Write a protein that binds this ligand. Sequence first.
Ligand code: NAG
Ligand code: NAG
Ligand code: NAG
Lengths: 179, 189, 13
Amino acid sequence: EEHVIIQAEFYLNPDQSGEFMFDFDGDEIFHVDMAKKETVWRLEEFGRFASFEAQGALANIAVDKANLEIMTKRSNYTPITNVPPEVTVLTNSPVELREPNVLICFIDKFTPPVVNVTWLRNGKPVTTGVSETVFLPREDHLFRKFHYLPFLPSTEDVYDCRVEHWGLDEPLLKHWEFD
Amino acid sequence: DTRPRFLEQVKHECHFFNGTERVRFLDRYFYHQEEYVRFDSDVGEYRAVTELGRPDAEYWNSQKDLLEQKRAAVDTYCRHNYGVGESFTVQRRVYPEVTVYPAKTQPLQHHNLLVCSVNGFYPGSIEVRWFRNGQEEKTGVVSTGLIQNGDWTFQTLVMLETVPRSGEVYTCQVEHPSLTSPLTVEWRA
Amino acid sequence: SAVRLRSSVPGVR
Ligand SMILES: *[C@@H]1O[C@H](CO)[C@@H](O)[C@H](O)[C@H]1NC(C)=O
Ligand SMILES: *[C@@H]1O[C@H](CO)[C@@H](O)[C@H](O)[C@H]1NC(C)=O
Ligand SMILES: *[C@@H]1O[C@H](CO)[C@@H](O)[C@H](O)[C@H]1NC(C)=O
């Protein structure tokens, strides 16, 4: 095949979390912010060429929630087995001292779609400028996710991406430093 | 929080071959990671994938209006959405940035690794090859593989294990759909 | 223009 477009949905109990998104060849086209009832395009340019009525996503998620109730009973309340993530930290371009760059924390091959992710600079939580994706679908029906931290590379700072997940016995820290 | 979790997933998939010349639609339902029932446009009906999905397959197949909605999806859904997004997805082309820098396989040791860093490109299909004085070097090449950055760009590092000698010219060559001819970057010892 | 969505089907029982 040349291309695949997937409308991917999930609903999770008891968290009552539901997600709705479109995937093109593995990249997110958009997702719907359920609380705001708004379409969020992954790249801003996308919304100049296309539109999506966010309300429609809400109807599907309601059905998925009702279907989960049905399937849970049918399965005799067999719960999900936790699958802990693989975590990788990398930069999006070659690092040059005092040249603005971005750290990427890639959290992969896990389920359920619930994770706590923290960026650490010299052992301290940082939130300035951070961003993140929603939960992204995998062909094996696990999930992946991205977290981003713009930063100014220096010999004086070390970074870690810290990931907590129910499939992990301890939080997973993945380190990055200059060199 | 040790409370048990329960997950429902749905994936409505459109598979395209040669533009919209050939199209396949899949309506897929999941409990945790287990697909239990699906509609395949190749078949035109729902089929249970596991025993868990049998009641839904029989129930859904008894609804003629529903099946016709699903049977038309290759046109009204897949071909339609492809048309909507084609200019910024199918036709998306972003050039790679190519950087060459030396590295070390083991600390303390002299420079014995040449890194060809290929960044920011789209789509993912790329071919990166190393050359030493005009000859392709196929031994000692290791890579990160293709890395998705999550923002509609890819990157990859392609490393050549080699001991640079004075005078040698190394070339990293990159082929990609966005290019009309190979992109080459030289590095001299 | 407008992206269309595919319906999710209500299950039995
Ligand atoms: C759930 O329980 C029923 C009996 O109440 C049984 O027939 C069925 O096989 C069970 N589901 C399983 C084992 O997945
Ligand atoms: C995230 O943190 C909250 C608050 O401490 C906690 O209740 C929850 O269990 C955590 N989630 C994961 C996946 O570790
Ligand atoms: C691919 O598309 C072109 C143009 O529509 C057509 O000539 C060709 O027959 C198509 N190939 C197949 C296998 O359908």
